[PDB]
Amino acid sequence: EGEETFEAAMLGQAEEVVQERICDDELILIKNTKARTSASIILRGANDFMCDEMERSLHDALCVVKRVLESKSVVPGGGAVEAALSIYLENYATSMGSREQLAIAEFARSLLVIPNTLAVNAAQDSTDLVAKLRAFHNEAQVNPERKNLKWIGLDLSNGKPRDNKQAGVFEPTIVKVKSLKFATEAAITILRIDDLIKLH
Amino acid sequence: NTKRESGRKVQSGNINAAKTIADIIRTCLGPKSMMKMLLDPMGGIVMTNDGNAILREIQVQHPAAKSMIEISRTQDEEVGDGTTSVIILAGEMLSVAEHFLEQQMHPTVVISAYRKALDDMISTLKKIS
Amino acid sequence: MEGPLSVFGDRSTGETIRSQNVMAAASIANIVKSSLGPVGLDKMLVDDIGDVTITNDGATILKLLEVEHPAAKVLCELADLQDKEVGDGTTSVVIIAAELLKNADELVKQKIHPTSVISGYRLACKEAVRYINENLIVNTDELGRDCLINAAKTSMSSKIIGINGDFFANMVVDAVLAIKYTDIRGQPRYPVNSVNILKAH
Amino acid sequence: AEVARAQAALAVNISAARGLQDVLRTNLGPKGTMKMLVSGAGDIKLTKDGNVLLHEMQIQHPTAS
Amino acid sequence: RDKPAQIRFSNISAAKAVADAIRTSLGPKGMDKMIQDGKGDVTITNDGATILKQMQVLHPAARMLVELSKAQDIEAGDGTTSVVIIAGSLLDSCTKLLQKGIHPTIISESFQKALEKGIEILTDMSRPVELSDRETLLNSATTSLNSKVVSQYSSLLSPMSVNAVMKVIDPATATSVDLRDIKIVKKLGGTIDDCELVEGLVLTQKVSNSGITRVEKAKIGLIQFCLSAPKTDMDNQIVVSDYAQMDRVLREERAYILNLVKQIKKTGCNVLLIQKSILRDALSDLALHFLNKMKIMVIKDIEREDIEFICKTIGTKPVAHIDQFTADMLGSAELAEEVNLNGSGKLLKITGCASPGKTVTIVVRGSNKLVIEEAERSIHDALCVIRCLVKKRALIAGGGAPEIELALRLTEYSRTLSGMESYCVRAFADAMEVIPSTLAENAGLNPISTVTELRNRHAQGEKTAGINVRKGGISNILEELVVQPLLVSVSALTLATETVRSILKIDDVVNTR
Amino acid sequence: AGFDATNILNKLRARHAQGGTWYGVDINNEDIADNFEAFVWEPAMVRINALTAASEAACLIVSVDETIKNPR
C-alpha cells in the first residue's frame, strides 16, 4: 500500500549514495557500505558478449583462486602429475614385490590413459604426450619441490604441458585426493559379491 | 549398459548428409537455378528450390539431416535469408576439410581453420564490400 | 552380454561376465575418453529420437546412459558421485576405473590374503594423495609473483579472450575480496560469483 | 530415407512421362481412336479428349501428377 | 532303468552345480551381480550368505540346497554357507564312488561314517567355552559381530546379546534358549546404541498417539471378544436406507462404547489385544477412538503374535465381555508403556509382565531402517552365536579352515575304517578341503596360484594348524580371532550329509499326477 | 619349479629393487635366490650372444609387413 508509513531501517549506511553514469551506464553506487566492505566490478566490453567473453576467462582465475583457498596447494592439472606418480608408484611397487609389486604397479600404470586421451581430445594425442610427460618427469627428480626441475604440469585447452605455472587450467589439490579414492572405488566396488546365484 | 560409437562412421554420415543436402540446393541456387522435387510416400510430388521446405516435409534423420534444418531455421529468422546457403556452405566446408584432414588425422586444427577462415572472410568482404 | 544363453542375470560365474565387465567398463569408460576434458569433443547424443543432447561432460553423459551392467553402474554412479563431490574429475575417475577393476579383482583371486590387493589401490592413492598436496611444482596459486592477481592474469592469459586480463588480474582477487562472507565452518572461502558483477559493455 | 539425384532422378522423370505420353498418342485428329478408360468404378469410357483420360486414371509416377 | 541312473546323476548334475559357485564365500572376490531373475527381474546381488536364501532354483536337487541353506541359519545363526558349500564336497565323493561303482546306499552310509568321524574331530579340535559366564558369550558374539554388520555397535549389542541369552539361559549347557522367546522389535527413532534389551514381554504393538497406556497398573489384556454397541455387538432396530438413519445408529454406537472403554480403564488393563476375529468387524472404528480415549492401546485387529506373546510370555487369556467388565484373566502388568524416543515411535512395553524366566526382548532401535537393520541382524547372530555356545559350546575356526583340519585327520579315519567306505569317506575326506580354495577362487586372472596350496598349506601345518582365511596366514585355525561355535559346523555337517543320501535314496525321479 | 611368475618374480624384482645382485629363481631347488652364490651359473658370453641375437631378428621382422615370393 502507498499510504503506508516508512521508517529508516530500510535506509543504507554508506559514505554517500551517488549516481554515476559512465560508459552510458548508470548504477546506484553505494560508496563504502559501512557494515561490511563491499566491491563490485563493472565489466566493460566492446559488446555484450565481450563482457561474457571476458567473464568465462575470469572463471578459470576465479575458482582457482577460490579453490586453493579451499585446500592449500594444488596439483599440476592433467595426467602429467600422475604421469610421474606412475613410475614413482611402480617403484613403490617394485621394492614391495610379490603382490605388492603387482597391484601397486597395476594402479600406477592405469593412471596414464587420462593425459593422452586428454591430449587426444585436443589432438595432441598420446605418443606425443608420453614423450612430453614422463620424459620430463624423472626418478632423478621425483620431488614435487616447489619448482620445476621437471615440468609435471599439463594445461588443457591445449593437450600439451605449457609455461603457465599460475594457470587456473591446472586443477587444485581438492578433487585429486577425492577422485583417486573414487578411481580406486569403482575398481574395488565391483569386487564385492560373495558366492554367486541366479534367481530363476 | 555396454555401448560405444567409433570415429568416422558418424563423421562420414555427417559429411554424407552434409554434401547431399547441399547438392540440389546449391544447383537450385543462382540466376541459373534447379528444382528439388520431392515425391511423398503418398505419391504427391513436392517441387521446391528450398530443401528446407523439402526435408522438413520428408524424412528428417538423426545425422546432420537433423542439424541442417536447425541452422537453416537459425538462418531463416535472423536476417530472413541465406536459408539455402548454410546447408550448401556447411556441406561444402565439412567434406573437403575433414576427410583429407582426418586422413591427416586431427579434429583440432580443422576447428581452428573455421575461425581462421572467418576473419579473412570478414576481412575481404568488409574490404571489398 | 556374452556367455551362455540359458542362464542370465550377470550370472556366468566365470570371467565371461568379468571380461564382459572389463568390456562393460570399457565402452562406458570409452565414451568418456573422447569427452575427457574440455578439449573432449561435445557429443551430440540422441536421448530418444528428436530428443538429443550435445555433451562433452562424462557425468552428463553418465546421466543419460541407463546401466544394465554393474560395471557400467559402478563407473557411472561413482563419477556421478565424484560429480556430486565437485565435478572436477568426472571424466577422469571414469577412465582409469576401466583398468583398475581388472587390477582390483584379479589379484584378490591370487590371494596373499583377500584384503591385500585392495589397499594397494588405496595406499598408492594415499601415496599420490600425500604427493598431491605436496605439489606447487606446477600451478602455484597458494603463492606466486602476484599470487592470485597474476594467477588471475595467468588464468586469464590461459583462457585469455584478448590482450586483456590485466584489469582482470585484479577483478578476480576482488572476487575473493568483494565477498567477505567467509564461508561457514571456519573457511575463509569467498565465493567468486557471489560478488555483484554487473555486465555493461 | 533414400533419394535420387543427378540424371538418375532425371531419367525416372523423363522416362515416366514419355512412357505415359505415347500411350496417349494413340488418339488425335479423326484418325486417332477412342481410348478405353476404366477407372475404379468399372465403367468403360472411350475418349480421344485429354481431360477425361488425364484426370480419371494414370499409371502412377511422379510425372503423372 | 537308465532313468534311475541318470536322474541321480542329473540330480548330481543340477544340485552339485549349484553348491559350488556357492563358494566365493567371504572375500572381496568376483564382480558384483545385477541379476535379471527367471521372470526377468533385475536384482543387484551380493554377499552369498543371503544370496543363499535369496537364490531361486528349480528342480528337486537344486532346491534342497536352499532347503539346506535354510537349515543351518535357523539352527545356529552362523555358517549359512557352511552347510551348503560342503554339499559341493559331498557330491564330489558321491559321483567318484558311483564312478568307482560304489553303491548309493554305501555312499549314503558313507555320509554317516564320515559324519561320526567328523563330529569326532571337530569336537577334538574345538576349545571349550563357558556359555554361562559373560566372557565367551561376549567373545563368540564379538567374532560373530565382527563378522556381522556393525563392528562398532557390536559393543552395546553384545551385553544386549549376552544378557538376552543369560536372561533365558538354562542351567549349564544344553540345546535350548530359542530366538522365539526373544522378540526383536524394530523401533523407529533412537539409534543402535539406543537399541534396548528389555527383560520382560515387549510388544511390537503400535497404536494411536502417546500417553496411551503409559500409566501405572496398566495391564495388557487379550480379548477374544470386542466391545458392544448398537451396530457393534448389541442390536439395531433401525435400518439405514437413509443417511439420517445412518447417524442415529452410529451415535448410539459411539455413546455406548464410551461407557465400555471406561470399564476397560477401570479394569486395570490399559492394553486390550483386540481379536483379529471380526464380530461385526468386532471392535468399532468408533470404538478404537474410545479405548484410546481412556489411554488404552488397541489398534484395529491387533497383530496376532502380540496376542500370542501375551498368551505365551504373560499368560493372558480373554475375559468376559466388557459389558460384564472383565474376568481379569488379562495377565499381570502394573506397567505397560508406550515409549517415544525423541518424541517419536510406537513401542508397547509390558513391564512387570509375567515372564517365564524367558522371552527376553531386545528392542532394536534407530532413526533409520538401515540403522535398525545394521543393529538388528548383527545382534541376531550375536544372540545366535551365544545361543550356539549354549546349544553346543566351545569354538572351532571359521571360513572353512578347520574342516581341512578335519579333512587331514579324517583321511586318517579313512585310513583306519578299512572298508569300501574307508575309501568312500576318504573320497569325501579330502573333498572337504575345496572350501577355502573355492572361497578364494572367484576374484580374477592368472588363476592357479593359491588353490592347491590353499589345501597343501594346512597339511604342511599338519594336524593342529592351518591357514586362517579371515586374517590370512597359517596357525591353529580355531582361534585367529577366527571362530564359529563348535555347533555351527557339526550343525553344517549332518544336514548336507542327510540331504544328499536322499538323492541316493532316490531310485528315480517322478512327477505328481 | 611349480611357482607363480609374478610374485616369485616380483619377489626377485623386490630383491632386484633391493639386493639386485644374483637373485633369481632356482628351479630344482624350487625357490628364488642369488644364483651365482647358489651355484646357478652360466658364462656371461652366450647371454650377450643371446642378447645380441635377441633384439636382432626382432628388429628385423618388425620391419617386415612385407614378404615377397614366387610360385614361378
To the query of whether residue E81 is one of the catalytic residues in this protein, the response is yes
Eight-class DSSP state of E4: H
Return the beta strands (E) in E128-232 as ranges: 185-188, 196-199, 201-203, 219-223
The values of phi and psi at residue E465, to 5°, are -115, 160
Of the candidates A160, C33, C91, the residue with the CA atom closest to the CA atom of residue B7: C33
Q: Which residues of E45-81 are buried (b: 16+ CB within 10 A; e: fewer)?
A: bbbbbbbbebbbbeebbbbbbbebbbbbbebbbbbbb
Q: Do residues C3 and E31 make contact, with C-beta atoms less than 8 angstroms apart?
A: no
Q: Which residues pair with E199 in a beta bridge?
A: E360
The set of cell numbers assigned to E156 is 552395546
Q: What are the Cα distances from residue E192, in Å, to D64, E152, E367? A: 84, 10, 9
CA–CA gap between residue A172 and residue A166 (Å, rounded): 11
Amino acid at residue number F70: N
CA–CA gap between residue E413 and residue B41 (Å, rounded): 86
Q: Which residues of C19-36 are buried (b: 16+ CB within 10 A; e: fewer)?
A: bbbbbbbbbbbbbbbbbb
Q: Do residues E383 and E182 make contact, with C-beta atoms less than 8 angstroms apart?
A: yes
The set of cell numbers assigned to E261 is 472403554
CA–CA gap between residue E187 and residue C71 (Å, rounded): 37
Triad E161, E166, E168: Cα angle to 5° = 105
Cα of E365 to nearest chain C Cα, Å? 30
Please indicate the experimental technique that yielded this structure.
Answer: cryo-EM
The values of phi and psi at residue E470, to 5°, are -75, -50
E191 is known to lie in a ligand binding site: no
**Which region holds residue E343: left if phi is over 0, alpha if psi is between -120 and 50, else beta?**
left
**Which region holds residue E211: left if phi is over 0, alpha if psi is between -120 and 50, else beta?**
left
Residue F4, chain E, CB below 8 Å: the answer is yes
Q: Do residues A67 and A174 make contact, with C-beta atoms less than 8 angstroms apart?
A: yes
CA–CA gap between residue D54 and residue A19 (Å, rounded): 80
Long-range contacts of C140-144 (CB under 8 A, 24+ apart): C140/A73, C140/A74, C140/A146, C140/A165, C140/A166, C141/A64, C141/A65, C141/A67, C141/A68, C141/A74, C141/A166, C141/A168, C141/A172, C142/A68, C142/A72, C142/A73, C142/A74, C144/A166
CA–CA gap between residue B9 and residue B14 (Å, rounded): 8
Q: Do residues E234 and E184 make contact, with C-beta atoms less than 8 angstroms apart?
A: no
Tell me the CB-side half-sphere exposure of residue E96, using CA atoms within 13 A.
Answer: 18
To the query of whether residue E301 is one of the catalytic residues in this protein, the response is no
Amino acid at residue number E27: G
**DSSP per-residue string spanning E170-194:** -SSS-S---TTTS--EEEEBS-STT
To the query of whether residue E142 is one of the catalytic residues in this protein, the response is no
**Residues sharing a CB contact under 8 Å with residue E436, sequence separation 6 or more, in sequence order:** E399, E400, E401, E404, E454, E455, E467, E469
Residue C100, chain B, CB below 8 Å: the answer is no
CA–CA gap between residue E78 and residue E272 (Å, rounded): 38
Q: What are the Cα distances from residue E155, in Å, to B96, E134, E146, E159, E324? A: 74, 13, 10, 8, 51
How would you class E172 by CB atoms within 10 Å of its CB: exposed for 0-12, middle for 13-18, buried for 19 or more?
exposed
CA–CA gap between residue E233 and residue E257 (Å, rounded): 10
CA–CA gap between residue D65 and residue D58 (Å, rounded): 9
Chain A residue numbers with beta carbons less than 8 Å from the beta carbon of B108 are: 122-124, 159
CA–CA gap between residue C168 and residue A58 (Å, rounded): 7
CA–CA gap between residue E30 and residue C70 (Å, rounded): 12
Residue recorded with cell 470386542 = E226
Chain A residue numbers with beta carbons less than 8 Å from the beta carbon of F11 are: 97-98
Q: Is C14 helix (H, G, I), strand (E, B) or coil?
A: coil
CA–CA gap between residue E218 and residue E335 (Å, rounded): 5
Q: Is A93 helix (H, G, I), strand (E, B) or coil?
A: helix
**Residues sharing a CB contact under 8 Å with residue E502, sequence separation 6 or more, in sequence order:** E64
Name the residue of chain F whose CA is nearest to E450's CA: F4
Return the beta strands (E) in A7-155 as ranges: 14-22, 25-33
Strands E185-188 and E360-366: parallel
The values of phi and psi at residue E284, to 5°, are -70, 150
Q: Do residues E396 and E489 make contact, with C-beta atoms less than 8 angstroms apart?
A: yes
- CA pseudo-torsion sign C127, C130, C131, C132: positive
Name the residue of chain E whose CA is nearest to F8's CA: E449
Q: Do residues E270 and E219 make contact, with C-beta atoms less than 8 angstroms apart?
A: yes
Residue E27, chain C, CB below 8 Å: the answer is yes
Residue D2, chain B, CB below 8 Å: the answer is no
Return the beta strands (E) in E204-301 as ranges: 219-223, 269-274
Experimental resolution (Å): 8.5
Eight-class DSSP state of D31: T
